[PDB]
Amino acid sequence: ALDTNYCFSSTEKNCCVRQLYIDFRKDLGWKWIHEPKGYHANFCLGPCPYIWSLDTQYSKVLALYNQHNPGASAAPCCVPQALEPLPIVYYVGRKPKVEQLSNMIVRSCKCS
Amino acid sequence: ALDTNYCFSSTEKNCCVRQLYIDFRKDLGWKWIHEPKGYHANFCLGPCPYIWSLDTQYSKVLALYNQHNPGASAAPCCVPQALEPLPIVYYVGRKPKVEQLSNMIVRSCKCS
């Protein structure tokens, strides 16, 4: 499976959602959000082979187009299929507010 | 728009479907297909900004996560949303056959 459960290993480099904790201010510097300090944004990296969870037929073709030529960066593009919200807390002028951003997290990538 | 019509320019480096003609044998070396020699496989490259056609909410966040740190390859992943078939011609033993591969081409990418 290509989720953040099996992608949290040390091997495999194909379409696998890798950890990507993002500290709102450290990484995005977001100033409109106070808490939490960050979150498990996660993300997907690595190209896609010809046997992975290829969804489109162009994912198996271009997959070889790259696996054949070394140095070619036209491989496919693994992406976050399912996502997750994000319970934060920002400030509007002077009143504190807590919300839940939508799709502000990853729970499973794929190969589009 | 992020299609193969506006992406066929010389500027812009974000989620834009770039040309990717693939010569079945030259690039994929495919031996199960005789014709055509190749096709306009096309593909998508470049990361995704925070104003492009972001579809998921995680595309605007990780978008800055990379745009903020130089050298970070955890950016988003532009992908071929719509695709196109492909009229080919291969051989089964000794009989010639013509088909139309499905999604064997790109007609518009996006940012998953």
Polypeptide structure, described:
It is classed as growth factor. Two copies of one chain form a homodimer. Chain A is mostly beta strands and 112 residues long. Chain A has one domain (1-112): Cystine Knot Cytokines, subunit B (Ribbon). Chain A has one helix spanning 58-68, and strands at 16-18, 43-45, 78-87, 90-92, 95-97, 100-111. The two termini of chain A are 15 Å apart. Chains A and B meet through β2, α1, β3 and β6 of A and β2, α1, β3 and β6 of B.
- Largest interface, chains and sizes: A-B, 37 and 37 residues
Approximately how much helix is present in the residues of chain A? under 10%
Which CATH architecture of chain A? Ribbon
CATH class of chain A: Mainly Beta
What's the helix count of chain A? 1
Specify the structural class of chain A.
Answer: mainly beta
Order of strands, widest sheet of chain A: 1-2
PDB class: growth factor
Keywords: growth factor, mitogen, glycoprotein
Assembly: dimeric
Entry title: solution structure of TGF-B1, NMR, models 18-33 of 33 structures
SSE layout and pairing:
The structure is a homodimer of 112-residue chains.
Chain A: E1 16-18, E2 43-45, H1 58-68, E3 78-87, E4 90-92, E5 95-97, E6 100-111
Antiparallel strand pairs in A: 1-2, 3-6, 4-5
Structural features:
homodimer, Cystine Knot Cytokines, subunit B, two-stranded antiparallel sheet, two-stranded antiparallel ribbon, 30% strand, growth factor
Brief write-up:
Two copies of one chain form a homodimer. By secondary structure, chain A is mainly beta.
